Write a protein that binds this ligand. Structure first.
Ligand code: HEC
Length: 104
């Protein structure tokens, strides 16, 4: 995907609840640094729902593609309020941005 396009998507749809940078703060949602290769619900010091702690998948390109299409269908009972992104390219750009920014 296109990293700079994904940044614009992140800032528009995600940044109000999430930071990405190393040492970034939790907000409404958890900081996402280190997300890739981490299991669900494992950012330290954040009140996750049991739902998000129990989903039990490893976050990566493919599981984020499925999650971001419809978060509540993938993790029923999640307290993340976000409808999803049905568009494929948008998700791919976003995920490419996240794979850079949450690893930098
Ligand atoms: C506030 C209204 C949010 C919006 C906008 C976005 N996210 Fe979110 N996210 C939010 C919360 C409160 C939580 C915890 C949910 C729970 O049930 O505990 C989350 C969680 C995630 C995760 C899982 C993180 C993990 O398992 O460590 C991811 C990958 C995630 N959120 C990504 C994300 C994306 C990419 C967003 C824009 C498209 C987005 N969220 C918006 C709160 C909010």
């Amino acid at each position: 995907g296109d990293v700079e396009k994904g940044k614009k998507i992140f800032v528009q749809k995600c940044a109000q609840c999430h930071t990405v940078e190393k040492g970034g703060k939790h907000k409404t949602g958890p900081n996402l640094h280190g997300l890739f290769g981490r299991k669900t619900g494992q950012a330290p010091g954040f009140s996750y729902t049991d739902a998000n702690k129990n989903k039990g998948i490893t976050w990566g390109e493919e599981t984020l593609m499925e999650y971001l299409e419809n978060p509540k269908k993938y993790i029923p009972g999640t307290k993340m309020i976000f409808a999803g992104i049905k568009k494929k390219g948008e998700r791919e750009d976003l995920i490419a941005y996240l794979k850079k920014a949450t690893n930098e």
